Symmetry: C3
Subunit: 197 residues, 3 copies
């Protein structure tokens, strides 16, 4: 509720980017208590949907799902300041995020190549914002639509956080070594170098 | 194979101290034997039943209990209208699915490592002869409707024996909190 | 290109595929969630037949795939095993390296899979096998959990040698199945399908 009202205030205000203003087109009641769809806009084009769960605490923690990205706008949106502002905004209201990566070719390619989720273009954006636990879902559309998502979470403790980063170091070490293309290696090196501060 | 028997019981509703349960809508699902029964507690919509009537060498009957109105959670989960509905489904379906998301007790127990059969909701299913349990806990961010218990009647007296040996083992692999005494009193069968 | 493929699909589906069961036609198209994704509603004669979810490809990122699902329940005993079903898959195999076929309404395949026949030597999967598909998966996810989880998933192999290796494996599975089964009628059927494969 406190959370509900501040998601609406920011969104109804609009989020400013160099790609256009991101606006709430329409809000929608979900399956459950505390669950809403927010249909978003970028400069008068449809952008994407946010599936929001506000929390029913001890039982269910809050989460956002970012999906339904307008393929006409994939090349405007991915790697943009609009996307940064979006994830920043959601970062301040959610400890768990799912982003659909299907329309994001760079992240797609990097995951297919074995890049750790946190060090993929999209994963890395979430990493910068404090999400430290990563799961890559790659289920065939064909079987079930909507199963190419990164799930990311903030560490519960300074202990879980340390464990998440130790695993990331291992995963990175395994990638170097498996990787055959020096350009992909340099890009992953430089994301990992960021983290190391 | 019998809706008709399911239909006769459903309009001209179901008893219960929390209000009557009655039919509202009714459709034809993806497959010839699949249907959706919309239900009410009083005038409020309650819940949806997805029934599958069987195609019996190939597919066995099952009912799914989902789409439960959040304004009734605290009234329905725990209630005798819940039991009267299960009780009634237990007479017609050897396999049942119930979404436990709105059920804050079942949820909290499952998350504690309680075996599905000894959780609030699952225990209610154990009474009615369901002996095989599966807890599905799939993030809604991935896929909607993946928080459900799957419960199954034994095909055979020997299948029952086996499911009950698994339950004893899950009971023990759990006492390895204070709600322990709650699970303990549930297993005393 | 996703567009050449697209245009080839419409042309032969709108011309129609002739069968003794009737002409299979494309009667409706809708854009899916991704740009190269469509639902192609198909009729048999004048009755709805099924839906093809087509994914045209966005190579190298995503390979093309076709999902055949939503078989008209009152056409199941007409479609499965027909010349129509064969001519449909045959068309699909000329355009997609990966296929998904919903087997829920196909009781023979359902029955065979349950008795542990390898997916490739079931009635449905064998039909895909004959067309070049070599990697097989049997999905059997309960419908009360998630609609759409009784599918065969099959893929064309990348090379002739990978193709030779998965077939050796199908053989082990076949011989493993054939000495683990009663129902000599099933065994006779699976054996025919396997002898053919040479
Ligand atoms: Ca082609
Ligand atoms: Se019926
Ligand atoms: Se029916």
């Amino acid at each position: 509720m406190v959370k509900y009202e501040e998601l609406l205030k920011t969104l109804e205000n609009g989020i400013n980017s160099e790609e256009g203003e991101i606006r709430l087109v329409r809000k929608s009641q979900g399956r459950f208590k505390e669950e809403f769809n927010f249909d978003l806009s970028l400069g008068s084009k449809p952008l994407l949907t946010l599936k929001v769960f506000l929390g029913r605490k001890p039982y269910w923690q809050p989460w956002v799902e970012v999906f339904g990205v307008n393929p006409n706008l994939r090349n405007v949106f991915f790697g943009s300041e609009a996307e940064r502002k979006l994830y920043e905004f959601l970062s301040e209201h959610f400890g768990r995020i799912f982003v659909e990566y299907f329309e994001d070719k760079e992240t797609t390619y990097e995951l297919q190549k074995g890049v750790p989720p946190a060090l993929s273009r999209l994963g890395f954006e979430l990493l910068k914002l404090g999400y430290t636990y990563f799961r890559d879902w790659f289920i065939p559309e064909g079987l079930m639509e909507g199963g190419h998502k990164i799930q990311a979470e903030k560490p519960k403790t300074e202990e879980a956080k340390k464990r998440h980063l130790e695993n990331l170091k291992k995963e990175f070490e395994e990638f170097i070594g498996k990787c055959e293309d020096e350009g992909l290696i340099k890009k992953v090196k430089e994301r990992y170098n960021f983290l190391e501060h």
